[PDB]
Design a protein around this nucleic acid. Structure first.
Ligand SMILES: [Mg+2]
Ligand SMILES: [Mg+2]
Lengths: 142, 56, 193, 99, 216, 136, 43
RNA sequence: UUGACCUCAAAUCAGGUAGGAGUACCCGCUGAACUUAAGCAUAUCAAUAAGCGGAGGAAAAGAAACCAACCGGGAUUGC
RNA sequence: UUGACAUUGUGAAGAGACAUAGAGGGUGUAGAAUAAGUGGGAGCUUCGGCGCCAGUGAAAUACCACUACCUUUAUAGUUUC
RNA sequence: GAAGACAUUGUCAGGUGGGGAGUUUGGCUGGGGCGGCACAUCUGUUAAACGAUAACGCAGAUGUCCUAAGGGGGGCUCAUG
């Protein structure tokens, strides 16, 4: 399956959750007892990985929250044209479906490709939507 | 005026802003803060052109 | 609730069923008053036989078409063949049903014969004069009983010619089952140029 | 349509000699009389057409009887009434073309 | 499938009738499928890309270059296919006019798994701009077999324009083979395409130096 | 239009299957309530029938036929003196007019097994428990 | 007390939610600043 | 000017009629929840109780826009 | 609160969208030229001329088609605003 | 006078709606709550040499992985010194 359930108390920091059908990454967790007799409630503060928005939800601790599958994958650039990166996989597979980043990451990547470094791109998959998060340079195998 | 969701706005101006003059119009949009949004949208267009110029 | 090896019961007593309980304590008294009503009706219609003449007629479904029974009234075609109008038959005591039809000649002939015997057996009084009193009977149904027709004779000769009466039934069922596909194949064979 | 004599099959049932009874007058209730035909023709001449009938006339003239029958099936209840309505409107088109 | 095999058979029949008998051409004529897709946006929708290998080759003689190592070049001597080594690529020294000349020289490129990393570093991104990027080959596989495979490759990639075209095959092949290849190419195209057989704008079959014929 | 359920502020105080307020429909017809108001206006008359004449978005318009059971032209004229029998007081209130029988469902057939001799009468008849002297 | 007002209740006297109320709110909810375009003391 | 017609009124005009009671049974409208489901929301209780309108010695229904598929039956009601 | 249908009739203009009938059109620089793109194409030729090798240019030129985007006329047209 | 086929009204359809309605808010447990899972399972032991056998007893494990890490055959012998 694309996504799998988990418990709120089983969740911990720097883990992925589904909040309002968005892949989110937790920055804050806090548990407070509801009433003296009652079970504690978990208040979760998380950041969407793709959009960067801050989303929070509180739930019972025993409640089950949905968790996405996030895969980070490593590729080499071939060209940046029309806002669409062209990447090259190990064993020689090529994809052009990735859109170029639109922020300061995209600006730095564009300048780095213009001045000619060999750039290593990390793109993540979660719940059927695809994006690029970071780039490095290959220190060896020039 | 033939793009989506514009006639819904145009009904309200006929409903409540028919009897108005431009001094009051500028005062109310400055007091409601939409003019700053229009300014920042045109500014974002300006850095959209400007970043291409700096790249060249 | 559920318990030892017992059948599953379905007793519909979850409403206020004790509000609707009819115990027929008045069976005997109701029978007595019913006989009283019959006797006072007979005294009121003192020559007439307390019930109309009903036709013999064939029972509807395949479970009951082997039997014959009493109908509501005679067909207008039956009373015209008997030779009297429907209004006159209704006045002299013959039940007439305007909405049943005659599709069976044996039933038609039986009802015409039954009307002929009724017209032979009754006495119709003049409307004005003497009234020659005639000691009523109380049941036209008992004076004209419904008789089941004799379908066959009890002894015959064996007429066997080799079809076994099972192959015949099976072939009839098969040709009914594969009727319409055969005319479909025949139609496409005919329109195949 | 005679019965076969056996209990199953196509014409199952007992063979009895038939009678073919006299036809009931209520079986001819929907039959059109001369006087009502004359009245219906005269009031059709007097009243003319309803708006959905006018737009059906345009649909046979432009978009054909298939779209005309689809619109008449949406407008009236059933496909049978739609077919009869499109047939009589086509008759009105032919008669007005003759006029 | 909206398109029917008998209609494909018919249109192939007048296509081969025009190409072979009535107006014969000296060069061998390739049969082309030109498609246009409908109600689709390159900017928002996912850019589909896919490839299939036809059983009988569309272009037997099209020029191919093999970038290769020592083993790959030694095998390429047996294959008879043009090759330049890693030392040759280093010679080239990222000069744009000569690599553009090479890109217009060779339609297809086949490269080794080892050297496919630094093919962009020696050559740059103008191969990705042209759309001719080298295909990986390994020591285990047969180079001439993969030359036949690449010569029989059919690739659909969206890009920016909403119309594509591929070469189904030659005029000179047999009619059933041409029908089967055009049918499997249309099926592959609609398999790559989302909401299949309804985002198909137009399908056109043509021969080289021939008129267009419209299949839906 | 519909019949709004007359409850204060829409609170029904029950299970959620009975929380509907707006889309509830009256079981009798507008023709029926029209002739019932006409009968209350002229209680000395007897309602015979009614027919539609006109409508708009707000109102439906009916014409009600009424017969005077005290007038001598209806006391005589044996075709119509059946309306003078006291069992025909407020036929429109008991649902004995044409639209009343239509709304009560009084028709022959297999489609009217619930409502053929009276819905409550049939319900009592098939919810009665019948016990005889010699128990069967 | 919370039975008597939206603002009632609590172990300290405080409003709880925001006091700016939507124009589309219903009777019994419109207690506070109804459809406020802005709040606070401007200078 | 006069005399009609249509429509709408007024009379302590001549003569009538309706209301209220009773309500076991009858014809309608409206309409729950307790309860059961070992919890509970559909369901059930129940097309019931409560509420409202209208009759009679019975009421209602009733002489097929019926049932059927048979060799066909033949208004309604009740067992 | 928003939309549709009905209540709901009577008149004029102006835009827009489809159907299918046909027309023309595309100029940063460089490059012989006005490069919308794609895909085929090494021979097509009507001139024995144009492409091809070669020049430049991201994109190359004949000879073919396709697809957008534009403007453009018309229908007893279909329609919406 | 104003307004005008727009409001209004009727019926559907989407949104909003603790203002209100109805209901729910596990179990084991050296009291309950927090904790844990002894709640479906597996290995060794407690376990008293057939079998069975408890505790919130002890030491651990499971919600997978594998087109071979399955099946057949052949050849060879491993850790360590
Ligand atoms: Mg109402
Ligand atoms: Mg408070």
């Amino acid at each position: 399956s694309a996504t799998y359930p988990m418990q709120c108390s089983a969740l911990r920091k720097n883990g992925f959750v589904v909040i309002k059908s968005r892949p989110c990454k937790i920055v804050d967790m806090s548990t407070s007892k509801t009433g003296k007799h009652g079970h504690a409630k978990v208040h979760l503060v998380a950041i969407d990985i793709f959009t960067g928005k801050k989303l929070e939800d509180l739930s019972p601790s025993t409640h089950n929250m949905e968790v996405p599958v996030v895969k980070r994958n490593e590729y080499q650039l071939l060209d940046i044209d029309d806002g669409f990166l062209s990447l090259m996989n190990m064993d020689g597979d090529t994809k052009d479906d990735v859109k170029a980043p639109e922020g300061e990451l995209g600006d730095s990547l564009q300048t780095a490709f213009d001045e000619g470094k060999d750039l290593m791109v990390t793109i993540i998959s979660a719940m059927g939507e695809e994006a690029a998060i970071s780039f490095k340079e290959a220190a060896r195998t020039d | 005026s033939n793009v989506r969701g514009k006639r819904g706005k145009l009904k309200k101006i006929q409903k409540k802003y028919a009897d108005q003059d431009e001094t009051e119009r500028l005062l109310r949009l400055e007091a409601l803060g939409t003019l700053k949004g229009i300014e920042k949208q045109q500014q974002r267009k300006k850095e959209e052109i400007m970043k291409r110029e700096v790249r060249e | 609730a559920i318990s030892k090896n017992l059948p599953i019961l379905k007793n519909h007593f979850r409403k206020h069923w004790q509000e609707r309980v009819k115990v027929h304590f008045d069976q005997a008294g109701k029978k007595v008053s019913r006989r009283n009503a019959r006797a006072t009706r007979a005294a009121k219609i003192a020559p007439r036989p307390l019930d109309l003449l009903r036709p013999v007629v064939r029972a509807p479904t395949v479970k009951y078409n082997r039997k014959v029974r009493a109908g509501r009234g005679f067909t207008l075609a039956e009373v015209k063949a008997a030779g009297l109008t429907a209004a006159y038959a209704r006045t002299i005591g013959i039940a007439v049903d305007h909405r049943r039809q005659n599709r069976n000649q044996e039933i038609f002939d039986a009802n015409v014969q039954r009307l002929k015997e009724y017209q032979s057996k009754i006495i119709v009084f003049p409307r004005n004069g003497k009234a020659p009193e005639a000691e009523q009977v109380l049941s036209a149904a008992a004076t004209f009983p419904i008789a089941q027709p004799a379908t066959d004779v009890e002894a015959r000769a064996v007429q066997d010619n080799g079809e076994s009466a099972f192959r015949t039934l099976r072939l009839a069922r098969s040709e009914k089952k594969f009727r319409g596909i055969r005319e479909k194949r025949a139609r496409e064979k005919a329109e195949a140029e | 349509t005679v019965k076969t004599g056996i209990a199953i099959g196509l014409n199952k049932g007992k063979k009895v000699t038939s009678m073919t009874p006299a036809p009931k007058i209520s079986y001819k209730k929907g039959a059109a009389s001369n006087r009502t035909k004359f009245v219906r023709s005269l009031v059709r001449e007097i009243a003319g057409l309803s708006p959905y009938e006018r737009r059906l006339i345009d649909l046979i003239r432009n978009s054909g009887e298939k779209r005309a029958r689809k619109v008449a099936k949406k407008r009236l209840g059933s496909f049978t009434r739609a077919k009869a309505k499109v047939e009589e409107m086509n008759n009105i088109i032919a008669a007005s073309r003759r006029h | 499938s909206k398109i029917t095999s008998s209609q494909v058979r018919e249109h192939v029949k007048e296509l081969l009738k025009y190409s072979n008998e009535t107006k014969k051409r000296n060069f061998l004529e390739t049969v082309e499928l030109q498609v246009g897709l409908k109600n689709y946006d390159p900017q928002r929708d996912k850019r589909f890309s896919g490839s299939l290998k036809l059983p009988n080759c569309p272009r037997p003689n099209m020029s191919i270059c093999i970038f290769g190592d020592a083993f790959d070049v030694d095998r390429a001597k047996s294959c008879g296919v043009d090759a330049m080594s890693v030392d040759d690529l280093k010679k080239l020294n990222k000069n744009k006019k000569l690599i553009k000349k090479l890109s217009k020289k060779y339609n297809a490129f086949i490269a080794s798994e080892v050297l496919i990393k630094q093919v962009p570093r020696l050559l740059g991104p103008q191969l990705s701009k042209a759309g001719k990027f080298p295909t990986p080959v390994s020591h285990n596989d047969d180079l001439y077999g993969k030359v036949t495979d690449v010569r029989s490759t059919i690739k659909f990639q969206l890009k920016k324009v909403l119309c594509l075209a591929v070469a189904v095959g030659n005029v000179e092949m047999e009619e059933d083979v041409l029908v089967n290849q055009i049918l499997m190419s249309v099926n592959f195209f609609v398999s790559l395409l989302k909401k299949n057989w309804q985002n198909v704008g137009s399908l056109v079959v043509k021969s080289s130096m021939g008129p267009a014929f419209r299949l839906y | 239009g519909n019949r709004k359920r007359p409850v204060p502020k829409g609170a029904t105080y029950g299970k959620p299957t009975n929380q509907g307020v707006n889309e509830l429909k009256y079981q009798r017809s507008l023709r029926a309530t029209a002739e019932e108001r006409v009968g209350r206006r002229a209680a000395n008359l007897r309602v015979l029938n009614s027919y539609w004449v006109n409508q708009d978005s707000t109102y439906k318009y009916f014409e009600v036929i009424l017969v005077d059971p005290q007038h001598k032209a209806i006391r005589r004229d044996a075709r119509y003196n059946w309306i003078c029998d006291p069992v025909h007081k407020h036929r429109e209130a008991r649902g004995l007019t044409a639209t009343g029988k239509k709304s009560r469902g009084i028709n022959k057939g297999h489609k009217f097994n619930n409502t053929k001799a009276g819905r409550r009468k049939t319900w009592k008849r098939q919810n009665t428990l019948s016990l005889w002297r010699y128990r069967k | 007390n919370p039975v008597d007002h939206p603002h009632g209740g609590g172990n300290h006297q405080h409003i709880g939610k925001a006091s700016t109320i939507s124009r589309g709110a219903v009777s019994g909810q419109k207690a506070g600043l109804i459809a406020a375009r802005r709040t606070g003391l401007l200078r």
